[PDB]
């Protein structure tokens, strides 16, 4: 038989291991020749693997690179302008790679050039609340200061935005061992910890879904008209640079002014974690000076797009996508995901060579420039947005397969909750102590949902990966899955975006048998297989009804901290609760029909599959969210304070956020009520797409 | 047989006549009780006629009405402030209706209140070019003046916008016999001309597709959050009032200052048509004073929505829609269209009672408040936008069936050009001298296309009617058809929006046998029948390819009046021409497949029908056009200078318009190039939806 089991059994741990080794010997930085060569290899192998067509789609997008002959670094500088301390120019390369060329040194992509000089302020994680504490409670003013912030908690782009709105004239990011050094584990190469000379690369944009900074809305193709840099989306206005904790120690050890306000501001280095501004008495004349000479430039990028045509509904697309570009070797990020995709493709290709075709079309993508802002995925989707909005069933992301070895982690739309539960009950747990038990069992045991006994945690989708354009802009049901660490006893993985992220890191310390990879390949691949082959689409609209009520209760509770204002301005959540009730009733009746409808009738079947496909789509507002036109989903957006975190009812959440500080409360509560109306309407409207159609 | 011929033969001239008489005995002003009663009647009769369901959808929208106890009027006022001349307070009611109550006096809906006083300037039709002539060439400054403008040429809302941007402090609109009195024909009741005391009502909004001024984007339902009046969309900021030519004569006869610049500025009254400002010497101390006390208020409106469920594709909607609200009796506008719809419904209802059902679902609509800005249609579509965008096949409008008795007039998307040609060859001409000939033959004879021998003129869709939200916002293929006058020998019909528009006007002077009405019922009804029943959707994508090339040539030629700037800024149309070539090739290959595809396969059939349905949709840009977010179609928008006229490639047109006057030519030509990119991309993208899907 050619069924899911056949698909699944053809996947091999040993193949994934080979592919990963193959994808991680040299750096594959976006826009470089090496990453173009890997694209051509992937294309040629997907063809050999059996796909009907395999094409490169290229775009010319804004990227960012250091100047090879004019290195970035930071200094402590004295009263005379002598540079008495310099941060490192590169990370010590790992064993055996000390002669690899083209290792991009640590930098913050998209930072403007500058050599600002000033006194440091230390701002913890540079969260919204860290700045509130600093400005409101401690009365420290960051205006014209250089801020130094530790990585962690939120997306680094948010930290930079926060710093910039506080008036900072530069930002230094560093990795504190509190957040990137696990107790009892050694530094790379003898363990999986971050060494003191290790540094986290990454872009510091605030794109809010735009894609290429120069071409929002439209693909960056050969005739594209581009904005001037000054009107580009999302670029930071102050210089930024990241450093390791050996260097950070040297910058922080002399810090004076105020003490930290509490222990949640103290990391693990042997320094006071004073907030500043500036250095203690003896050194108070010393300053910090940054030197940033990176350039932004328009560079060609390449996605690989593979098609396996569906036998029955070729005009319905299930997409499996993940990026190929890496900061350096990409041993975890992304090649551990990409090797998984490669083997998924090979397995589907095997079935196809024996004459099988999935019911719906499967598209496979190797995205480029994800690291520079989700650019490849976003441009491709801007190009193909009409096809995707009318034909797109689902998007399964395929970045890093592992960030730990403890249990499964799934973030997805409610519409896939049942699919995921069912698929996992049929998969074997790879975990020690769960031999012969199901993946569902071990996952549920180790990661219980807060809401329900005997069910696993499944989180909402945020952003910071290639599903963003599909889910938040276009409204295509999306999900992701990987193996992760135990949060209870234990920022993501310590060697994230460091030169130390290598094949060896994975083979030695994360997944030597490649069994966690194989399980992730089964989850991802299994999702795609069911999406593309089940006669009725494997979405359950009732799971949306359940979370919608939870979100409505949550956002109501937030509002209810201001009872006086809710009375004075007549702020009611009745309409939202009403819409959610209707959605629950209508969804329940639709499921009955979906179960009882006449199975013989393909039109009836297509009608009802269309209603399931268009349900996620129904949550899109074409006007977008306030000031964020590419975040169009009304139920989910990335948090305005942390791009990685999903927010529910974001329109209302943001209108409520810090509302007690607004100077015109009438206007602010007005906007709360506007967003309630928007949400209630959209929920009712989505429910109506599940009513009998005529 | 239950086929089109059966449908068509069941339609009766005598029935239309009865319905029209029934719909025109009392006024049916939007928001009044009488118009609610008619809605309930229409609902109850559509039910009797056989429809599966018939519902009222209501909304609470901003309307506008005069103050019953504080009448609007205009005065000539002297140095002492005596009002020595007053315009009329009402039109002389027609014979036999002099005791009808509730005839709304002439007014400009949505005018703000005020009593400004000042000197007149006469601005011809108050077109963009009339103001250019006035300001640029004649050096006349309208700032702080009251302008007086003759109706005609463009939508009155545009005139008011133009006046307002020239600094006018009020506007007076009047009907000149040059534009509303046909030579040799008598005034109402003895002919179809406009009497001197007749006045044209109508709104003066600039909504640009928004609908209800207070709720852009979302339906004006029970929990809607509304903008404050100050932030409302489209309201004029200066008072406005319309008058007849008896009154206008009195205002214009004393006019001094400059002479008219040429004879295209002179109407037919016995006055000099001096531009002013102000009156000639003796009277130069006299002023004009307006008194406007109308109020805007939120008022409930009611659409009637009838459904005839499709037998095979119930989830595909063909919509026949037209408004029910009138300024007064609505003898032409809208009841001559509404009576036609009523009889269409009855005929489809007859077939249904004998067991027939169309293949696709047919929705029938009686829209409310069209006269106050397309409000009923727009709100309903905002409410149901998800259903309409994924299920909407086509929209056929059904306002006035006649504005003349000479020939057929069709405006539609290119996708319906073939359908219209074919249907008309099968219909009988009702014209004198074409007995036993086809409608196509007489129409083609009397209204030849400029482009092709042996074909009729079909115009592009503009706006100023209820198809706007469907076509320009949502991208649903749309069309309209009526009988019209001969433009060669002969502003629309003289009694437009006047109390004189009555049943008698129609029965005596336009269509005594009701044969033009019957023909329009066959065209409209026939379109709907084919749309709803043909196995393959009756659209021909190649007709779009042909006009796209014509539009590209046209917009290229406009640009080519500035060859020097096209060189200096590198302005190329290559990408647009390339996209149009690709669209032509791809469309040609798609038609071959549509003809040769395997007829047995319903999925293949649904795929290809989906591609035809989504083709109009593909021209939508979700970002909209510049500053007009509800005009989203890239190929067609209403002219920024005249809401009634369609513009092709409006983004590029507007970027080119008056470009020689812009102060930063680099920036202006930049935006030209941006819009070219937008257009070329969208055309390519639309063509790609017609490629093999996988
Ligand atoms: C969740 O789902 C339910 C459907 O079960 C929706 O319930 C509707 O609720 C709205 C508003 O609450 C009701 O609105 C009211 O409509 C009355 C007229 O209703 C009838 O006539 C219409 C045709 O216009 C029919 O469609 C309908 O079936 C009824 O026959 C109005 O008279 C009401 O207005 C008056 O009272 C209100 C309230 O005080 C005043 O403000 C007004 O000024 C006026 O006096 C009112 O507008 C509606 O009828 C209900 N529909 C149905 C089918 O039951 C919920 O709205 C929906 N939730 C959300 C969020 O959408
Ligand atoms: C109308 O339809 C045709 C399809 O027939 C489109 O033609 C395409 O035109 C674009 C731009 O004109 C071509 O773009 C060029 O692509 C080259 C690479 O193409 C190959 O490799 C790709 C994968 O990336 C394959 O998809 C493709 O089939 C080819 O195998 C680039 O090398 C070119 O860039 C270089 O030259 C240009 C031009 O001077 C320089 O600016 C660059 O810097 C670089 O040196 C270029 O980008 C494309 O290949 C054509 N496609 C096909 C299938 O033929 C039209 O674009 C379309 N019209 C519109 C408006 O969309
Ligand atoms: C990764 O694997 C690929 C393919 O198996 C290797 O590329 C092949 O290498 C040789 C050149 O030595 C050629 O003869 C083949 O044509 C290549 N195939 C393709 C599809 O490119 C590649 O060498 C491997 N890379 C590493 C670092 O091991
Ligand atoms: C990278 O920095 C280098 C070296 O400091 C820059 O090269 C210099 O640029 C100036 C003026 O543009 C020249 O006069 C010098 O002769 C150049 N020096 C060298 C060694 O070439 C270069 O401009 C920068 N590169 C980028 C991409 O900005
Ligand atoms: C930190 O780096 C700077 C820049 O390379 C060093 O300062 C330079 O030193 C050379 C030789 O001593 C001088 O000719 C340059 O003029 C200096 N440039 C600047 C900008 O200061 C500095 O010595 C280094 N400091 C440490 C402690 O290593
Ligand atoms: C997950 O599997 C459950 C349990 O088998 C499926 O629910 C059953 O589905 C069939 C409909 O074909 C019903 O007849 C059973 O009554 C359902 N059982 C229960 C308890 O609901 C569920 O459909 C699967 N989910 C998905 C997306 O496939
Ligand atoms: C328009 O036609 C309708 C229906 O044929 C008339 O309404 C009917 O009038 C009588 C009241 O005299 C009632 O018994 C029926 O119930 C009404 N029917 C409906 C559906 O409303 C109406 O009188 C006519 N109007 C005019 C002005 O002639
Ligand atoms: C219409 O105009 C009338 C009459 O000129 C207005 O009624 C007057 O309003 C003022 C203050 O609001 C009262 O003191 C007068 O007593 C009222 N006069 C009468 C005759 O009632 C009325 O306000 C206006 N109507 C609307 C809808 O604006
Ligand atoms: C035009 O209308 C105005 C308003 O009705 C008339 O002026 C009023 O006349 C009465 C009685 O003569 C006075 O008590 C009012 O004070 C006047 N009001 C104003 C605002 O002037 C005027 O007479 C009419 N003019 C003509 C020529 O008919
Ligand atoms: C209008 O009628 C024409 C002429 O009959 C139709 O074109 C024919 O359609 C069939 C496809 O079923 C072809 O086999 C013929 O070869 C076509 N003839 C020509 C000259 O094209 C055309 O399809 C009709 N248009 C619509 C929308 O129905
Ligand atoms: C912070 O410092 C800057 C510059 O000296 C000043 O303009 C700004 O007002 C200060 N903010 C506060 C809250 O004192
Ligand atoms: C692998 O598993 C064991 C759990 O028992 C753990 O102690 C080790 O830390 C894990 N490796 C990584 C990289 O987390
Ligand atoms: C028109 O008149 C106003 C007011 O007196 C003035 O502000 C404006 O500049 C004038 N325009 C021109 C072109 O003279
Ligand atoms: C009706 O037809 C004749 C055309 O011969 C024309 O003279 C008359 O003006 C027409 N009626 C109207 C209202 O146009
Ligand atoms: Ca772009
Ligand atoms: Ca609205
Ligand atoms: Cl992922
Ligand atoms: Cl019409
Ligand atoms: Zn990644
Ligand atoms: Zn990454
Ligand atoms: Zn009308
Ligand atoms: Zn009208």
């Amino acid at each position: 038989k050619h069924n899911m089991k056949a698909f699944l059994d053809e996947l091999k741990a040993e193949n994934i291991k080979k592919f990963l080794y193959n994808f991680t010997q040299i750096p594959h930085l976006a826009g470089t020749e090496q990453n173009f060569q890997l694209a051509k290899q992937i294309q040629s192998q997907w063809k050999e693997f059996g796909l009907d067509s395999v094409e490169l789609a290229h775009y010319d997008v804004l990227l960012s690179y250091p100047n090879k002959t004019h290195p970035n670094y930071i200094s402590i500088i004295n009263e005379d302008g002598n540079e008495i301390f310099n941060t490192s120019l590169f990370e010590p390369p790992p064993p055996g790679y000390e002669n690899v060329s083209d290792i991009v040194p640590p930098f913050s992509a998209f930072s403007p050039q500058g050599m600002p000089e000033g006194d440091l302020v230390y701002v913890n994680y540079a969260r919204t609340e860290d700045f509130f504490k600093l400005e409101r409670d401690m009365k420290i003013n960051c205006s014209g200061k250089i801020v130094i912030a530790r990585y962690g908690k939120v997306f680094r782009g948010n930290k930079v935005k926060n710093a910039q709105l506080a008036g900072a004239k530069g930002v230094i990011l560093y990795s504190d061992p509190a957040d990137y050094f696990a107790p009892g584990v050694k530094s790379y190469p003898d363990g999986w910890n971050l060494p003191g000379g290790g540094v986290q690369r990454g872009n510091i944009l605030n794109l809010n879904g735009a894609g290429d900074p120069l071409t929002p809305g439209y693909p960056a193709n050969e005739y594209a008209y581009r904005r001037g840099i000054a009107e580009a989306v999302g670029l930071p206005s102050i210089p930024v640079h990241p450093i390791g904790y050996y260097d950070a120690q040297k910058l922080l050890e002399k810090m004076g002014g105020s003490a930290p306000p509490d222990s949640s501001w103290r990391g693990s280095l042997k320094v006071p974690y004073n907030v500043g501004p500036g250095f203690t008495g003896n050194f108070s004349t010393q300053k910090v000076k940054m030197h940033i000479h990176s350039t932004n430039e328009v560079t060609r990028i390449y996605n690989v797009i593979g098609t396996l045509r569906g036998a029955v509904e070729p005009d319905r697309y299930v997409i499996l996508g993940g990026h190929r570009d890496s900061w350096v070797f990409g041993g975890i990020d992304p090649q551990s995901g990409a090797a998984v995709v490669h083997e998924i493709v090979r397995s589907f290709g095997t079935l196809k060579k024996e004459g099988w075709r999935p019911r719906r079309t499967i598209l496979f993508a190797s995205w480029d420039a994800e690291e520079f802002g989700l650019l490849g995925s976003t441009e491709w989707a801007e190009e193909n947005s009409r096809l995707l909005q009318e034909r797109g069933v689902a998007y399964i992301n395929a970045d890093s397969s592992i960030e730990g070895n403890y249990t499964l982690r799934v973030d997805c739309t409610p519409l896939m909750y049942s699919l995921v539960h069912n698929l996992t009950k049929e998969l074997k747990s790879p975990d020690e102590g769960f031999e012969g038990k199901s993946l569902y069992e071990s996952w549920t045991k180790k990661s219980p949902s807060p809401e329900f006994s005997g069910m696993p945690r499944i989180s909402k989708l945020g952003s910071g990966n290639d599903f963003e354009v599909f889910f938040q802009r276009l409204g295509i049901a999306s999900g992701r899955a990987r193996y992760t660490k135990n949060w209870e006893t234990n920022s993501g993985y310590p060697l994230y975006h460091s030169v130390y992220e290598t094949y060896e890191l994975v083979e030695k310390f994360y997944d030597p048998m490649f069994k966690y990879h194989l399980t992730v390949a089964q989850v991802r691949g299994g999702m795609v297989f069911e999406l593309a082959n089940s006669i009725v689409l494997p979405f359950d609209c009732r799971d949306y009804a359940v979370v919608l009520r939870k979100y409505a209760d949550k956002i109501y509770s937030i509002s209810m901290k201001h009872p006086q204002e809710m009375k004075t301005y007549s702020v009611s959540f009745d309409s939202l609760f009403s819409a959610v009730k209707n959605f629950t009733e209508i969804a329940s009746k639709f499921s009955e029909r979906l179960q009882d409808f006449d199975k013989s009738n393909p039109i009836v079947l297509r009608m009802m599959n269309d209603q399931l496909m268009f349900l996620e789509r129904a949550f899109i507002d074409p006007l977008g969210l306030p000031d964020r036109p590419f975040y169009r989903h009304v139920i989910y957006a990335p948090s305005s304070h942390n791009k990685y975190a999903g927010e529910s009812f974001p329109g209302i959440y943001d209108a409520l956020f810090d509302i007690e500080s607004k100077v015109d409360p009438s206007k602010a509560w007005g906007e709360v009520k506007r967003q309630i109306y928007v949400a209630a309407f959209t929920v009712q409207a989505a429910a109506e797409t599940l009513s009998e159609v005529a």
Side-chain angles (χ1 to χ4, degrees), chain A residues 2-78 80-134 136-269 271-281 283-431 433-450 454-484 486 489 491-598 600-694:
Chain A
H2 282 144
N3 52 5
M4 205 195 310
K5 175 197 166 46
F7 164 72
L8 288 175
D9 287 339
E10 176 61 32
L11 304 162
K12 304 306 190 236
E14 182 60 40
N15 288 323
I16 297 168
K17 175 176 187 175
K18 293 180 164 162
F19 295 150
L20 183 65
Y21 178 84
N22 182 270
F23 292 167
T24 59
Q25 302 316 300
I26 65 178
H28 297 104
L29 188 62
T32 63
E33 178 73 20
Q34 302 103 298
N35 195 35
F36 176 64
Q37 295 312 322
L38 184 56
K40 302 227 300 283
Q41 177 195 329
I42 298 301
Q43 172 185 30
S44 150
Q45 294 177 296
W46 284 5
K47 268 172 179 165
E48 298 163 33
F49 290 168
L51 299 194
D52 303 295
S53 66
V54 193
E55 292 306 308
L56 297 189
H58 64 267
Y59 303 91
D60 300 313
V61 308
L62 200 74
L63 303 187
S64 166
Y65 302 108
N67 187 320
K68 275 183 215 69
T69 64
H70 188 14
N72 300 321
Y73 69 105
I74 298 158
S75 283
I76 289 156
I77 202 177
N78 72 26
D80 302 312
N82 307 332
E83 292 185 350
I84 68 188
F85 168 78
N86 291 334
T87 58
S88 84
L89 302 189
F90 54 91
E91 297 173 283
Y97 297 83
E98 318 90 334
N99 191 60
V100 174
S101 222
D102 299 305
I103 290 166
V104 76
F107 80 117
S108 297
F110 299 106
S111 168
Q113 292 185 354
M115 303 185 35
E117 176 191 304
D119 299 313
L120 278 180
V121 175
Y122 165 70
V123 304
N124 207 19
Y125 298 105
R127 301 163 306 175
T128 296
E129 61 262 39
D130 299 322
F131 283 101
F132 280 171
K133 171 79 73 200
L134 222 40
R136 299 172 169 187
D137 310 341
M138 300 176 75
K139 268 61 185 185
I140 290 165
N141 180 351
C142 297
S143 178
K145 307 293 184 254
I146 294 184
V147 314
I148 173 158
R150 44 169 175 170
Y151 272 132
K153 305 301 194 204
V154 309
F155 174 65
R156 69 188 82 71
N158 295 100
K159 305 177 183 283
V160 175
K161 174 168 134 83
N162 296 350
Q164 192 176 304
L165 300 180
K169 69 172 173 173
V171 177
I172 296 167
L173 299 157
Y174 79 96
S175 299
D176 198 296
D179 307 290
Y180 296 96
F181 193 98
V185 174
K186 292 304 191 180
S187 286
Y188 201 73
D190 302 324
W192 48 264
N193 270 337
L194 185 65
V199 187
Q200 188 193 134
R201 289 161 194 70
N203 85 74
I204 49 157
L205 296 172
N206 289 276
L207 290 178
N208 292 327
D212 172 41
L214 304 188
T215 58
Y218 307 93
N221 59 24
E222 272 290 354
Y223 56 84
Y225 184 74
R226 296 184 161 70
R227 298 187 171 193
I229 274 283
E231 291 73 55
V233 179
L235 304 186
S237 66
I238 55 182
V240 184
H241 194 72
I243 63 180
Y245 56 87
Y246 285 159
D247 287 339
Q249 173 113 244
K250 309 298 279 132
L251 290 190
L252 293 174
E253 73 193 355
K254 292 175 172 171
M255 295 259 260
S258 313
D262 69 67
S263 67
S264 70
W265 278 59
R266 279 207 293 272
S268 293
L269 292 167
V271 295
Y273 288 98
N274 291 335
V275 172
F279 294 145
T280 60
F283 308 106
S284 78
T285 30
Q286 296 177 355
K287 283 193 187 321
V288 170
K289 183 172 187 200
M290 299 178 81
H291 317 75
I292 313 295
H293 315 293
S294 304
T295 55
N296 294 324
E297 43 193 51
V298 174
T299 309
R300 183 158 295 190
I301 60 165
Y302 305 83
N303 301 323
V304 188
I305 307 301
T307 301
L308 184 56
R309 181 182 45 262
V312 181
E313 309 188 78
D315 78 335
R316 296 285 170 267
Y317 305 151
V318 181
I319 303 179
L320 176 60
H323 78 109
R324 185 186 70 259
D325 70 301
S326 64
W327 275 118
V328 195
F329 301 104
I332 286 185
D333 186 1
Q335 311 304 347
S336 69
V340 159
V341 172
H342 216 50
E343 180 63 352
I344 288 163
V345 174
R346 194 195 62 74
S347 177
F348 272 118
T350 294
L351 278 52
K352 194 257 213 185
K353 275 142 180 204
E354 303 173 19
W356 173 93
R357 274 189 180 287
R359 185 191 166 84
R360 310 184 177 84
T361 291
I362 302 170
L363 300 182
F364 299 96
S366 176
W367 303 132
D368 203 346
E370 182 277 355
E371 296 297 0
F372 290 81
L374 323 182
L375 311 181
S377 60
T378 306
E379 297 303 307
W380 184 80
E382 293 183 319
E383 178 171 80
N384 293 291
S385 58
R386 298 150 179 84
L387 310 185
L388 300 170
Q389 213 260 2
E390 309 307 358
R391 301 175 186 169
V393 170
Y395 178 87
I396 303 298
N397 207 52
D399 206 345
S400 311
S401 289
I402 46 155
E403 55 187 21
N405 62 6
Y406 182 67
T407 198
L408 196 79
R409 177 180 194 169
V410 180
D411 312 358
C412 67
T413 172
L415 288 181
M416 292 179 189
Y417 285 174
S418 172
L419 164 67
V420 166
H421 293 171
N422 288 1
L423 173 64
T424 65
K425 289 170 179 174
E426 289 180 59
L427 301 172
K428 283 190 184 85
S429 181
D431 302 5
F434 290 90
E435 299 81 13
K437 304 326 179 63
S438 73
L439 183 50
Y440 180 90
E441 194 181 310
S442 61
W443 175 34
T444 299
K445 197 68 206 315
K446 298 166 162 190
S447 184
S449 90
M455 322 262 271
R457 174 187 295 278
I458 301 189
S459 292
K460 65 176 68 90
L461 279 172
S463 189
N465 224 289
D466 288 314
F467 58 81
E468 187 188 68
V469 66
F470 302 95
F471 190 62
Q472 279 105 335
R473 196 192 295 201
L474 305 178
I476 295 158
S478 291
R480 69 191 310 193
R482 51 175 69 146
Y483 247 65
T484 189
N486 182 350
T489 74
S491 96
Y493 60 96
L495 297 173
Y496 173 67
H497 286 184
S498 168
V499 69
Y500 304 119
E501 232 204 86
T502 51
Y503 176 75
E504 288 76 36
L505 169 59
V506 172
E507 192 273 333
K508 291 182 199 304
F509 305 115
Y510 277 83
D511 199 10
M513 306 165 87
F514 282 81
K515 61 180 184 173
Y516 301 118
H517 283 74
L518 176 56
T519 292
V520 178
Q522 291 174 355
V523 174
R524 294 170 183 175
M527 290 176 75
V528 166
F529 185 101
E530 275 309 287
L531 291 159
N533 286 288
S534 177
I535 292 315
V536 174
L537 287 172
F539 298 153
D540 194 341
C541 60
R542 298 169 297 181
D543 288 317
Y544 236 130
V546 178
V547 307
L548 281 174
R549 176 55 185 274
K550 183 179 60 165
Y551 304 156
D553 297 328
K554 177 189 176 287
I555 194 66
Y556 173 78
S557 304
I558 291 168
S559 189
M560 274 299 302
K561 294 179 304 204
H562 319 266
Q564 188 44 243
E565 293 76 16
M566 287 185 64
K567 293 170 171 101
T568 301
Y569 303 111
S570 294
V571 182
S572 191
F573 288 83
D574 291 351
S575 56
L576 179 56
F577 286 116
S578 174
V580 172
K581 176 173 190 291
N582 292 353
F583 191 104
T584 309
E585 290 174 4
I586 286 163
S588 181
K589 298 280 153 218
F590 178 87
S591 315
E592 293 176 24
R593 301 198 308 281
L594 192 67
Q595 264 153 225
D596 297 356
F597 77 97
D598 175 345
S600 58
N601 200 313
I603 295 314
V604 173
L605 163 62
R606 178 67 161 218
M607 161 176 319
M608 291 198 90
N609 274 337
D610 287 357
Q611 291 178 277
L612 285 171
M613 185 177 72
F614 290 123
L615 180 61
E616 193 79 62
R617 216 86 80 255
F619 298 114
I620 296 298
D621 190 330
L623 302 190
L625 299 165
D627 294 321
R628 301 191 291 171
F630 304 112
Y631 293 156
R632 307 202 300 166
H633 205 286
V634 176
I635 310 314
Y636 297 118
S639 167
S640 297
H641 303 283
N642 176 11
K643 188 171 197 191
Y644 299 143
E647 195 50 78
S648 58
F649 288 124
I652 301 169
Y653 183 97
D654 289 342
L656 286 161
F657 189 76
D658 197 39
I659 190 165
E660 69 275 27
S661 310
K662 301 298 171 63
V663 289
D664 185 347
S666 194
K667 184 177 169 197
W669 284 97
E671 177 61 11
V672 175
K673 291 174 64 161
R674 196 175 79 83
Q675 291 298 327
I676 289 164
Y677 163 50
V678 174
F681 164 70
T682 306
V683 170
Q684 183 71 25
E688 287 178 352
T689 68
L690 299 178
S691 298
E692 300 199 86
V693 296

